[PDB]
Amino acid sequence: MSKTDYILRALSKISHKRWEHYIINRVVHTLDDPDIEFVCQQCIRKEGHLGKIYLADLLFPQLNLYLEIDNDARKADAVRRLDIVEATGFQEERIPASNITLSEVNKLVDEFVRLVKDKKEELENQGLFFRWDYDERYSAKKHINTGYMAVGPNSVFRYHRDALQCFGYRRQSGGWALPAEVAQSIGLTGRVMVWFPRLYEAGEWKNALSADGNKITEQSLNATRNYQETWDYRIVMAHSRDELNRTLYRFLGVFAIDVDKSSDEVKVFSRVYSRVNVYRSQN
Amino acid sequence: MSKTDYILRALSKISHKRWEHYIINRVVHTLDDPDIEFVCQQCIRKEGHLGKIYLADLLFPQLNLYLEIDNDARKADAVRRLDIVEATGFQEERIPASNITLSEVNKLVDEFVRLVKDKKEELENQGLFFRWDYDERYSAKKHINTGYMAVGPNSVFRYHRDALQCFGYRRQSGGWALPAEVAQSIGLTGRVMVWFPRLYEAGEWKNALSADGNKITEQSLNATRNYQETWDYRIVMAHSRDELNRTLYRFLGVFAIDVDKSSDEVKVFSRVYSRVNVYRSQN
């Protein structure tokens, strides 16, 4: 789907909520910068472990900013396809969709579009800002540039071959063991794999994700596939879906078996690191 | 329906056509002037007697400007509710919805929004520009100010009492005879009425409007209501409908019986004047 195709669907998909459509459409158009990513109607986890999902109306991946304008339909469904993103150290600006006039409302938008304008001066003054690159939407490139990978809007991957490239894949269905070299290089101590899990009942696994974002539970339905956990860390790239029901893999963080809580039938993994360095064979 | 309610439905009703929604929404927002009327998806007759209806995407009543971006669904239906407007001496600017990039497309919008910007400098320099007045959307006020009334977006009226006020109604179902005073005052010579016709089969009349806009045909179904035309001019304010199926009365022009072509059963009226002065008992 083309960038414009993307841009044109983004602005036009918000016709349910009339107030939201205005304010979204105003700001994006107002701003008139095609070097700036924006996401619409992205469900979200916010600061503090709450298990509560919020709907962010505008999110700018490349600045840690989202706009909120104050739904159980979407929230329940996105969760259902793990279409969530953890937006921590993400600035929240807000706009009230009640008890206000347009002349004030698009004053706020006028103010907020300055933020977006000004919070990009910093990232350009500090040489951290990298112009929106749509065609590398779901690739490694960003991550190899940065050298690390956090939970966020950025760490999403179309295919397995795309996340494994951040961990030395040169050539990857199911799981991939990092070579002991890279494992140690990126600063994980042990025996380490990337896991591409389903986080629901699927074939022979009834898996699950805590509301927290912080505990994976996995339960084998078939028992000939009960096993002993030999891995010290799992880097988890969970199966999830688009608004258009396409498969993406979301980086959930680096997890590790909780051994007391775990069993042969039912293992429990806790989240240990919410980011991870990425491996380039350098210096 | 509130102005904002209007403004917010206007921008948000265009989600069928993705290219159109962008360009509409860009320009209106881009322009950011609440002292400017705009209409969306207004079907239209254009220069030269063609009987061909076009869809104008943006129309600014208070400047004779509409934007077109290049449908049989709407066209057929609007006609069906006489939701047409004759836009003559109306400037046409155009934008191609095919074989173009966004960076160019919103260049055009950037240019076109200058026109809208600059074609309002004239009407302010020449003291003719009167800031958008939504709550008098369908009233007489405009017309009493101007002193005359043309076919156009402006000459539309919620109730009969609203058009008859332009012709001396002080207090009006069916037809209203202008007093001989006003008839002569506004410069029509004869015996003159305002007609509020249905322009289709309705109860005891199978009426019709030529594709031209220029000939009303009326045929009595009941025959005890065949009559001799005694009126010299009919000022016609035709029954029509909103996008939301509310009744409005559109000024079609000043018409007169074509006597050769007419009959007892079936009278034919031709359009003689496409505007009309309006009566104030002055000087």
Author numbering:
A (entry chain C), B (entry chain C): 1 to 70, 77 to 177, 182 to 293
Lines from the paper:
PvuRts1I is a modification-dependent endonuclease with high selectivity for 5-hydroxymethyl­cytosine over 5-methylcytosine and cytosine. The structure consists of two domains: a novel SRA-like domain that recognizes 5-hmC and an unusual nuclease domain that has not previously been curated by the NCBI Conserved Domain Database.
A search of the protein-structure database using DALI revealed that the overall structure of the N-terminal domain is similar to the very short patch repair (Vsr) endonuclease, with a root-mean-square deviation (r.m.s.d.) of 2.4 Å. Comparison with structures in the PDB using the DALI server revealed that the C-terminal DNA-binding domain of PvuRts1I is related to 5-mC/5-hmC binding modules, including the SRA domains of Arabidopsis SUVH5 (Z-score = 4.9; r.m.s.d. = 3.1 Å) and human UHRF1 (Z-score = 4.4; r.m.s.d. = 3.1 Å) and the SRA-like domain of another modification-dependent restriction endonuclease MspJI (Z-score = 4.2; r.m.s.d. = 3.2 Å). As for other 5-mC/5-hmC binding modules, the overall shape of the SRA-like domain of PvuRts1I resembles a saddle, with a concave surface at the open side of the β-barrel. The interaction interface between the two molecules is formed by helices α1 and α2 of each subunit, and involves hydrophobic interactions and hydrogen bonds. The binding pocket of PvuRts1I is shallower and wider than that in SUVH5 and UHRF1.
